Amino acid sequence: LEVKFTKIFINNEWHESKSGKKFATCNPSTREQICEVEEGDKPDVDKAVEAAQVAFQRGSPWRRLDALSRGRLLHQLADLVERDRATLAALETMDTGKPFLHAFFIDLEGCIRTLRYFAGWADKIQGKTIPTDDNVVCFTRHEPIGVCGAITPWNFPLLMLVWKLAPALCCGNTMVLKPAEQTPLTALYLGSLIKEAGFPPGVVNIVPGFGPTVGAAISSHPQINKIAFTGSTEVGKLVKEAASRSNLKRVTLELGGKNPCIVCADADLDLAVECAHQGVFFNQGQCCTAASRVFVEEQVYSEFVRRSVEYAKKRPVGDPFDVKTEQGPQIDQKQFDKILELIESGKKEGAKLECGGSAMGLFIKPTVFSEVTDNMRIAKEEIFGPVQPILKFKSIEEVIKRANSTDYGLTAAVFTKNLDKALKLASALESGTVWINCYNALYAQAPFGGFKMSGNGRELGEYALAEYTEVKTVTIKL
Amino acid sequence: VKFTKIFINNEWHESKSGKKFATCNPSTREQICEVEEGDKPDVDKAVEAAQVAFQRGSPWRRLDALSRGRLLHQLADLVERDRATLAALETMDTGKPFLHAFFIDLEGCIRTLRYFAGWADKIQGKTIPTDDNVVCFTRHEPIGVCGAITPWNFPLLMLVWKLAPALCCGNTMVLKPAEQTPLTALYLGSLIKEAGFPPGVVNIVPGFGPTVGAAISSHPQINKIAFTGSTEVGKLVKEAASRSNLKRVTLELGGKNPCIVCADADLDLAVECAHQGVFFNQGQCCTAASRVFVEEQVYSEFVRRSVEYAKKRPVGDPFDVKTEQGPQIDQKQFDKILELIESGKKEGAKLECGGSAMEDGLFIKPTVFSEVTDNMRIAKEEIFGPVQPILKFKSIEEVIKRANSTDYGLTAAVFTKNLDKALKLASALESGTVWINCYNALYAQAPFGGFKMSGNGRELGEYALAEYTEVKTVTIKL
Amino acid sequence: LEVKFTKIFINNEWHESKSGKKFATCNPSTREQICEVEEGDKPDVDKAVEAAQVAFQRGSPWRRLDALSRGRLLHQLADLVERDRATLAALETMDTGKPFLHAFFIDLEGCIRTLRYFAGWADKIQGKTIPTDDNVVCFTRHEPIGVCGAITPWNFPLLMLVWKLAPALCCGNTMVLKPAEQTPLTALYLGSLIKEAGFPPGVVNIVPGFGPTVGAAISSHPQINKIAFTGSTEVGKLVKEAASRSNLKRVTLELGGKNPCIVCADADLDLAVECAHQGVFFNQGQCCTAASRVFVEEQVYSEFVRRSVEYAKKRPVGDPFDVKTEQGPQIDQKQFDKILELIESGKKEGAKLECGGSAMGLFIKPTVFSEVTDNMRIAKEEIFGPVQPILKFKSIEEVIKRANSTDYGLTAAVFTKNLDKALKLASALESGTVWINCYNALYAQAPFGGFKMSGNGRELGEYALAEYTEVKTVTIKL
Amino acid sequence: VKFTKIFINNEWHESKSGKKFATCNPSTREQICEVEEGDKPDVDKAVEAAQVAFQRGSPWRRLDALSRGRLLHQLADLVERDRATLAALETMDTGKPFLHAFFIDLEGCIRTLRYFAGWADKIQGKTIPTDDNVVCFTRHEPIGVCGAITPWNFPLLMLVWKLAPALCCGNTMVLKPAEQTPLTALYLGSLIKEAGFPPGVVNIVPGFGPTVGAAISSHPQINKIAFTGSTEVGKLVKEAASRSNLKRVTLELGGKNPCIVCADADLDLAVECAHQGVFFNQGQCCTAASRVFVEEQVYSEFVRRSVEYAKKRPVGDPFDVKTEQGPQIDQKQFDKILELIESGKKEGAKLECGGSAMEDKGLFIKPTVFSEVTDNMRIAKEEIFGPVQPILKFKSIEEVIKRANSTDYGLTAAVFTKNLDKALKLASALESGTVWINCYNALYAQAPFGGFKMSGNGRELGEYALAEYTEVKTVTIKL
Ligand SMILES: NC(=O)c1ccc[n+]([C@@H]2O[C@H](COP(=O)([O-])OP(=O)(O)OC[C@H]3O[C@@H](n4cnc5c(N)ncnc54)[C@H](O)[C@@H]3O)[C@@H](O)[C@H]2O)c1
Ligand SMILES: NC(=O)c1ccc[n+]([C@@H]2O[C@H](COP(=O)([O-])OP(=O)(O)OC[C@H]3O[C@@H](n4cnc5c(N)ncnc54)[C@H](O)[C@@H]3O)[C@@H](O)[C@H]2O)c1
Ligand SMILES: NC(=O)c1ccc[n+]([C@@H]2O[C@H](COP(=O)([O-])OP(=O)(O)OC[C@H]3O[C@@H](n4cnc5c(N)ncnc54)[C@H](O)[C@@H]3O)[C@@H](O)[C@H]2O)c1
């Protein structure tokens, strides 16, 4: 499979970098180089931001479109992505090491449902008419914010981009996007379909490059109105801070978590075992929603640990293009070493290994730690790799205090047949999403986001539209 | 003056340092009293009080939704009871005409409280259609402990715009008034205790910016901070939030608000509205109409009648029945104003009245400048004083570009009888509020806030609830 | 306690019937006459409708009020009802035979919560701004429907009146009310409070009288815009048909039902026994929400029947004014003879009397039927008196078909600890309200109403506002 | 004409009676085909089929929300693929200019389908805060089996305004097109089947009013009905609904809609708008501008410019690219109109053009303008539904308000003025479901439509349409 699109994307034309520089992207499954990609910088960002400003200029074609046509263009874009679903899944797998079937049936399915879902909102973005006084007409407009910058991570490259572009374009904004340096490939392909669908030049522009260079340039730009970042807490902090330093641009942040997973005695234990396994080990464990703190009630603890080890010892690891591969390699050696060091962490600290604990190329064998306590490091640091740490609890209100004691709050899951327990837990957990008797159940129509240091604002759902619009009161006196 | 101490757990406290700052009457230039000077150790005590008041099982948490509303109505009952006392303190602290604080500043607080009293049992999440065997819904939960930082120009009302939605939504608060204007907030606490609010739901720490405010903005257990004040400090607040615990942030900041006048318009209506829109609150108001664009056909007549309005504006003792304009807040502001006046002369604008102080005394003569251009300082910097600069224009598409030329975007006003002209302008002005044939037309039910660098979220109306709640998704598999 | 209000209420003035006729109202507790009431007719109706028309006329004081003042007037009325709480409760007990404490702590509490809840909606009824084309402004108004008529039954006189008047006034309509002929007293007393709160003349008018006479004049009236009826299916059918044949006025109906009460094996039996008993015998069983069909899984059945009988054998029956009286007399002899004929029915048909079955005065003692089948009379006909029948079932899917087997669908209740059983039943029961491990849990903020033949619109919650507003599209082109 | 039979369970059926009725082209004045004549026993079978398809556990009920939407998009794709065929039949059955049915009627169907396609995964209930230990929420469930009864003036489009929201929300349907205009509905049935809607989700029974329509409105297992047609039959529908099972009812009825012209209006813009608003679809329109109030001081100049617009309006064969007005729908309407015209003279209005038919053979009526009209005349009170523009005269805004609100009708209103306050004051005072300003017939799938007072009950189009096709359930849980 050959990589067509490697340049910078602006006014629906392909540009090479002003500096002339280029950077490489590698296949984590072979460690070998894939291609060279134009490396943009502050000069390239400036150009893209101009373009998106002109395309947003009042009187521009994009602004003159009627709402329903914005939806038509997103439905066409989604049509093209379905036409080329296999290519895109494959570019994604070469760049991230993800199983091809996971790329094809998950990442791409999510991009199409998201794109279609927000095409549906485009003529349904409604403000309000407000009663005040007898002789007054007062109403509200949900106007487009303007120029929106988007900065995405390496673990769900295409999908995270789509979570932003889909509501942004639906609402009538324009965009300058920046993929992670590790994985520019799909984003760039997508830009080819954006031309082929009909989007007027300048509505979407794309500058690949590095964090402290292209990304900082966006976050600090004086004529970008709004920025949406998905990635690490560390960088999220800087992005909000550069945003406020510069022009006070609006900010959406989705960051990581140490997400709890609570198993009650009265759970259906195999559903629970099955979902905590999938929740830990999906996408090589390199996923923001990973189920990295599994609390089990004392009475079913050993039976839970046992059954989980079976699942982990039997999980096929290999070449992501093999159809039976359920786990590929980590993204690169930098993550590889990060993970194994943290396994040492728990060894060094008293946790009980039950399987794995070593490498196997860039593969790490599925690892289960038994008998984990809150103060351990694999219990407080997001591991972001195939490591399942299992803890033990006695009380319902005990487990609540313990799950809520991190600084983060992205996700939680609870497993029980008991109506009163499921709901009482769902209300008390400080989490952006609480799954009950399921894990990784995501929907285009259900909002997603963090409490606390897991982030700001929401993506997906009707709630995404609040992030891409500016509210205007018009008040008329008679 | 009865209330001077730090308010925590419905109790009055001396500063942990024992220090005290003085508050002063800008009319008499005499000192009203001394107020406890808080610092970070005081803020810690208040935040802890608000945390405890917010734990699950807490009296405040276990209250009915509708009970929260009844609590807000009883408070608004109390403010209406002590309405004259409160308006009186506010006039002492700010120099504001007593009748203005009584019929405007105080009237806003009672209706704001009443409006948000009615929202308590109407904060509604969503139930979301997904799959045949899935129940998925969203809950609008309180963010938690909420910080307010308010300015000196509308001390009690800018307070209430924050306190009122916050409580309605079930949060707790730590409030910091401006060092110049602490009294009303300290009095409001006593009414909160008399109203039956459980202790710790509201805590008030008076003191200063780089001290108490900075403590509030970077605290690790404040979840959300709401700021009204200057742009320079708003940036600092958001930076502190971004760098501490990523707390949610609302900003209401200033503006350079245009006031557009077509030859079409009711000139008598425009001249008074523009006049009241520049001079209200001694010009010290976020919504001040500091850039009056007039169509040349009616230009000179506008200047003539505005000059008359200004020459006849009664300036004097705020407590006298007929005072329309009191003294500026303090000597720092006073000098700021005269210095910007002078720059206008030095740069070529045409003085038509005022330009001077009066009895040295903190009063400034109502000042009108004609022949103003966009490059001038009196046309770009926010004066916060009784200075009305009048500009000139010819075409509508010319006026739009000139008005949107700031980095600000709080407020705009348009005067015309032409249906299409009115609506075209309402759509094109990049401002949070566009008034048509009125000015300063504010309602608890219409939201308020800035485009661009004038601010971030919204206060008042239904949109204010967005800023004091967190969206959780609960997804259940069957 | 002496009745003060006996006459017809129109333009805030008391009036004798045009005919001079009057009808008596009697105390079921005694069988004796309480007083005489002016009996209106089509002539008096016509006069009331004109009052409502003039007060709803454009430019009238009522229409000139701002929305938030409609709220104040509702808060003021609620305050009056709370001030005279015990008197209204007593008038209602005199007229219905209801326990005073039930009149005081339920009926009246529901009136005060409803008045206050809909006071909060008045300045919060919002239409929409709709995006279409570049040069078009389109928005909607939720305008007031106009003159609304309201017709209530005898079993909750004040409460059912309030359920219509609170949302109707909240949205700015005007009304003509009609109590049941059996209970006019409290409706009329309320009218005196309406004058005392400050509602403009004509906003509310009351014309007591009989169904086919005053009630038909309302349903048929060419200048009433909306009718809201609570009562019998038979009369509800006629009201809708008269409304259609006349002027096509809008219609709300809340009718009766045969409401199922489903008990699973894993239910908390004592809770389930407690609520199914209370849900049958509340208000002497004379309740639209009554649990006249109790399905039990045949593992707990006899143990359910047993404990049920203990509850029925000891529920104290006596003078509604005695503190410990939990069951008063039936509304009159006509209702009395309906129930005990219906008992006979079940005897013939093979049901097992477990207790009761006889009279004692106008009192019926708690009667429980066991071994009850779908085809029995007491399983299909609304008993509307203290008769608890108990059925038996094996499957979830069986009980689902059997409960939906009616033409009615007002309420349902479900008892189980099982998360999946609760929700499955909740989604599958064709009922306007489904309770889970509770019964008769009503809130001002939660809508109420019927599926199928149990009713049409909804009452309470935001959803009631739809029944009292008319939608207008305004579309402007530039 | 490939499709003439009864559509039930995505199959085709002959009437149980074996009877058929004729449909005829109002331009040829000849018969197009025969269509099965249904009666109650066929409506029972269709209703039955709609129930089984609606049973819990049925395919349609197990689809996820988004796939319901994907189906509606898929059907809108087919309507656009066969756009010409569908617009043609419509012109054959109605007399409508082909180009009007292609660019207006058929375009409204595709946008309506596509707008409500997007709503299927966005029908959102509420969660309600009550007590510390209570979970309370609402669900917006499908009402169940829905029946539609549509008129002959916009056959396909009035059908789609009903089918689209209903399907979106997961209902099933029994449709009945008007006996004059069955063809498009039966063609639609094929496209619903080719789109892969499960059998029974949509069922179509052609036939007559006191027959099939009455059978539908009184059916004990139809849960909800949506009716567009005349007021007199709308009353009958609601009555039958009340006598049977209290099924929910939506009514879109007629109007006598005012069109108000201020002196400060763009007169050229008002003239054409007023003209196209009276004469569209040969005047046979619920939105028709059947009462043109003009201010005295542009009055006679308005009349002058309208006459010119009328005398130059090309009447003729609907398939000629330059026809702007075809023939009336049949002889019955034809006589209605002429009989209302003559009474116009009898009562003293000033004919200014038209007032007669044209051919001896044809069903064409000359564009007819009346001046010097007054509120008491019949052409000012009764709905003409034909090419007749009566122009009235007024002085005051408060006077024009009272006069315009004086009907029992209240569907639609139009105001022409440049004055911001005049515009908005009238928009609040006019008791009408839709008030246009400086435009006419400005309809969008996103904006609701329907009557005040006797012009109807509910709304169609916009989010408000979903309210008529769902049933609200509260679920309250105690902990
Ligand atoms: N040495 C450490 O302590 C440490 C800790 C954690 C992660 N890391 C490194 O960061 C990576 C985390 O992976 P990730 O992509 O999911 O999260 P990330 O936050 O590092 O990157 C997310 C997105 O933000 C961009 N970005 C990075 N820095 C930016 C900046 N200052 N301004 C604007 N944008 C910026 C990135 O190019 C990317 O597109 C790891 O590969 C690891 O090498 C290092
Ligand atoms: N051109 C200038 O010299 C300039 C510029 C900006 C601000 N200021 C000062 O601010 C005042 C403007 O009036 P204002 O009250 O409306 O705006 P402000 O900037 O002083 O902010 C007002 C509120 O924010 C608080 N605050 C101040 N500094 C803070 C900090 N570092 N962190 C957290 N909170 C802080 C203050 O206690 C006050 O309650 C002026 O009087 C002036 O002294 C001056
Ligand atoms: N006042 C009048 O003069 C007047 C007005 C309108 C229609 N009509 C006559 O009605 C016929 C159709 O005109 P229209 O389509 O505009 O209005 P309409 O109300 O008669 O028909 C609309 C729809 O309702 C159906 N329908 C008719 N009677 C029904 C009934 N009893 N029960 C259930 N459904 C029924 C029809 O088959 C059609 O589908 C014409 O023949 C016309 O002459 C007369």
Side-chain angles (χ1 to χ4, degrees), chain A residues 23-24 37 90-91 131 160 201 215 239 260 265 281 294 304 311 338 375 378:
Chain A
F23 69 101
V37 175
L91 287 180
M160 290 308 92
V239 168
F281 291 96
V294 173
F304 188 90
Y311 265 82
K338 220 212 193 173
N375 64 312
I378 47 155

Side-chain angles (χ1 to χ4, degrees), chain D residues 173-209:
Chain D
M173 307 193 83
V174 157
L175 314 203
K176 144 92 167 81
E179 52 270 32
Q180 298 88 325
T181 48
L183 294 191
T184 53
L186 297 185
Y187 199 98
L188 182 58
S190 79
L191 296 180
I192 290 170
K193 184 198 172 149
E194 194 190 323
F197 280 94
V201 170
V202 183
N203 316 266
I204 311 183
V205 181
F208 287 87

Side-chain angles (χ1 to χ4, degrees), chain D residues 84 98 116 160 185 214 220 356 419 476:
Chain D
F98 173 74
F116 280 103
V160 168
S356 96
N419 184 274
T476 295

Side-chain angles (χ1 to χ4, degrees), chain A residues 241 245 250 271 437 470, chain B residues 56 239 243 455 458 477:
Chain A
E241 198 203 323
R245 262 236 196 260
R250 283 62 170 142
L271 189 98
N437 297 328
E470 262 276 337
Chain B
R56 254 175 60 262
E239 293 167 41
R243 201 177 325 200
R458 290 290 167 272
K477 174 261 305 143

